[PDB]
Design a protein around this nucleic acid. Structure first.
Lengths: 83, 45, 119, 217, 146, 99
RNA sequence: AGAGUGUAGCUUAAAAGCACCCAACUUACACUUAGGAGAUUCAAUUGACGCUCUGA
């Protein structure tokens, strides 16, 4: 009895052959940062976020306020650069 | 391209003094050798 | 309130109400105070123009002290003064982070939040 | 397929002397020698100066300077080899020792009945021989001397489209070990030329596209 | 579980090929894989030796950084003990007596795994361009026992 | 059996009171720091320049292999393959005073 | 002479992150600590500066 994955497997994208030619995680912090940035990806399996209280966040919220002030970003960046 | 590995420091934590000595070779070529006992030429036969 | 006890085999620990998370980029330094659920409440980054226009060497130790002091101010304005900070060993040995938490304590924020009542 | 059989070869020369020193670099040498002075410990001539002077003072109350002064005398008597072998000549662009600070490339001048080009030494690859062998055979024919121009790799260097009957050029390279030149006054205008004079000499695009594989230094 | 779509998600030893080999005395040398249209070399050794330990070490550090940035594999690098050469100094007036001066000779070894045709000729020309002062270079074959 | 020479002689342990002093000046320290900053600038510039030359002439050699394959279908294997001539390769460094 | 065009080396980034380099530790590499230089070619989405390929 087998069931095919319902989507890409987490480690399928990287190449399995020529693993000498792949750069390795020389440290702990780079692996940590990759892990945290992967943690918020929309995975097709069950996860912590699926169960622990997000109140079904994704839905556009209605903005009731003043429009942002129109600014010239080119001149503003130029002024900041001169400063 | 030779101004890259010419810059050097001695990374050993404890070391005696070294001095820039003009080492003459068998064909009259000078090498800046960091040698103690601050001589100025070592003529090798 | 209930802290998320456990996980007990991974890093970092989730048993807190607010965490101090420092990202140390090459060009910039930013620090955030976020609740356990994920949403951030306050943050100080050298990208922000208000402090970018003043400070020098946005990656410097003095830059991260300025970051710590300004976020101490804005978190006191937010009313939060208790939160945990979980560093790696080299981050905890980093002089930038040592002076950063010093800037926090002299800004008036106490780390090591209290324990649950009837935990 | 009518393709005109032609390759080419560039001659590289290794330098013998190093470049001028940047004055930030000389300030750096001074500062690093300062650090070495500060963190050095237990020098033989240092204690043969200090402790020897202290013991001489003690026995007076009851070497090193001589060695330093006679070695200074040795420095004054032995003048070093002249660095500047270029300004004294100023005119022997064909000589091997005209420039030693940089890498030089050799070129040969000949005028065709149709083409007037200052060309890098070309070659004619016979189909029955390998390109590296053809390059070294042409090198021997054009050099007419005893060159130990050791090659680097079988792979080529450059290929510039010229057609009149298609045609191509296949540039190769070979490192020169030591050079003895028979008939230093060859009417064939060979010349030892660096990158700057190389660019000055390149008239057409075919020559202008050869400066990107040579050692720009 | 084994019947589930998410089976085998915790598979990592296929990623880490390292079976903890006893790589301190093994002699499993890679050979020169030559396909004609695809040439690659084996373990070619590089030897830089000089009278100056500091400049030799600086050259070794420079080539190591360059090769690590060039994206080719470096298996191992090490150093040979110091060699001392004495200069027996004959006197100018009386040549019978024999005085002496002391001198040292240093060495270091760097090894390379992958060498394409253009890539390795490129590496050789670059290292000869950046070859330093007083340091002698010689690239030789693998078998070199201490 | 390896022979080791990364051990300092035991004579280097006793005589360690010769030069233990570091008495510097703010002006000299800032001069050193500025010099190190300009050194970082110069080394970054040198590395970038070398990288550009390497990449340009590497693209050019890739073009060489590509066009050799396109134009001569049989020469390319021999052009890639190694002759053994560069087995005992070795070069001598530069000098200061020419003979 | 025609076409494609365009943010520092790279980016379905909108002045960022990776990159790149210096010093310390490490034989060295690597890790880490302490440092550095950096870009939206100009004129009103339109026009005229740079690169590339195709030519002659």
């Amino acid at each position: 009895r087998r069931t095919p994955p319902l989507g890409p497997m987490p480690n399928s994208d990287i190449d399995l052959s020529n693993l000498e030619r792949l750069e390795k995680y020389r440290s702990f912090d780079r692996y940590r940062r990759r892990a945290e940035q992967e943690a918020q990806a929309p995975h097709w399996w069950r996860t912590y976020r699926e169960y622990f209280g997000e109140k079904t966040d994704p839905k556009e919220k209605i903005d009731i306020g003043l429009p942002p002030p129109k600014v010239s970003r080119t001149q503003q960046l130029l002024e900041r650069k001169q400063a | 391209d030779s101004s890259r590995a010419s810059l050097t420091r001695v990374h050993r934590q404890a070391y005696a003094r070294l001095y820039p000595v003009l080492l003459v070779k068998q064909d009259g070529s000078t090498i800046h050798i960091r040698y103690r006992e601050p001589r100025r030429m070592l003529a090798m036969p | 309130a209930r802290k998320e006890r456990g996980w007990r085999t991974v890093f970092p620990s989730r048993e807190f109400w607010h965490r101090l998370r420092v990202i140390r980029t090459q060009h910039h330094v930013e620090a955030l105070v976020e609740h356990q659920n994920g949403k951030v409440v306050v943050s100080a980054s050298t990208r922000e123009w208000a402090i970018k226009k003043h400070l020098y060497s946005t990656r410097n130790v003095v830059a991260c002290e300025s970051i710590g002091r300004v976020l101490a101010q804005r978190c006191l304005e937010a009313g939060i003064n208790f939160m945990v900070y979980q560093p790696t060993p080299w981050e905890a040995a980093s002089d930038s982070m040592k002076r950063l938490q010093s800037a926090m304590t002299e800004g008036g924020v106490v780390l090591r939040e209290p324990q649950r009542i009837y935990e | 397929s009518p393709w005109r059989l032609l390759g080419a070869l560039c001659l590289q020369r290794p330098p013998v002397v190093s470049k001028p020193l940047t004055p930030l670099q000389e300030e750096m040498a001074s500062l690093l020698q300062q650090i070495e002075i500060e963190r050095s410990l237990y020098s033989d001539h240092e204690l043969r100066a200090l402790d020897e002077n202290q013991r001489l003072a003690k026995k007076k109350a009851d070497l090193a300077q001589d060695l330093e002064d006679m070695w200074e005398q040795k420095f004054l008597q032995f003048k070093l080899g002249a660095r500047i072998t270029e300004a004294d000549e100023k005119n022997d662009r064909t000589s091997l020792n005209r420039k030693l600070d940089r890498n030089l490339v050799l070129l040969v001048r000949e005028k065709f009945g149709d083409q007037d080009v200052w060309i890098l030494p070309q070659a004619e690859w016979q189909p029955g021989e390998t390109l590296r062998g053809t390059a070294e055979r042409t090198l021997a024919t054009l050099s007419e001397n005893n060159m130990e121009a050791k090659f680097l790799g079988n792979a080529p260097c450059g290929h510039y489209t010229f057609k009149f009957l298609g045609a191509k050029v296949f540039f190769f390279k070979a490192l020169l070990l030591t050079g003895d030149f028979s008939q230093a006054g060859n009417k064939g205008h060979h010349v030892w030329v660096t990158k700057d004079e190389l660019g000055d000499y390149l008239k057409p695009k075919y020559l202008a596209q050869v400066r990107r594989f040579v050692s720009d230094l | 579980y084994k019947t589930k779509p998410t089976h085998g998600i915790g598979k990592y030893k296929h990623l880490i090929k390292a079976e903890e080999p006893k790589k301190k005395k093994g002699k499993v040398e890679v050979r020169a894989i030559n396909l004609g249209t695809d040439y690659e070399y084996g373990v070619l050794n590089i030897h830089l030796t000089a009278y100056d330990m500091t400049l030799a070490e600086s050259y070794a550090q420079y080539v190591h950084n360059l090769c690590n940035s060039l994206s080719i594999k470096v298996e191992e690098s090490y150093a040979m003990p110091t060699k001392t050469i004495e200069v027996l100094q004959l006197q100018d007036q009386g040549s019978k007596m024999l005085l002496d001066s002391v001198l040292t000779t240093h060495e270091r070894v760097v090894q390379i795994s992958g060498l394409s045709a253009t890539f390795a000729e490129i590496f050789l020309e670059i290292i000869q361009s950046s070859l330093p002062e007083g340091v002698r270079l010689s690239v030789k074959e693998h078998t070199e026992e201490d | 059996i390896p022979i080791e020479d990364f051990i300092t002689p035991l004579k280097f342990l006793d005589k360690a009171r010769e030069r233990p002093q570091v008495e510097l000046t703010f002006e000299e320290t800032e001069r050193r720091a500025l010099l190190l900053k300009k050194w970082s600038l110069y080394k970054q510039q040198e590395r970038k320049m070398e990288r550009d030359t390497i990449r340009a002439m590497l693209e050019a050699q890739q073009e060489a292999l590509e066009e050799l394959q396109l134009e001569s279908p049989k020469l390319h294997a021999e052009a890639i393959k190694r002759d053994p001539n560069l087995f005992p390769f070795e070069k001598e460094g530069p000098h200061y005073t020419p003979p």
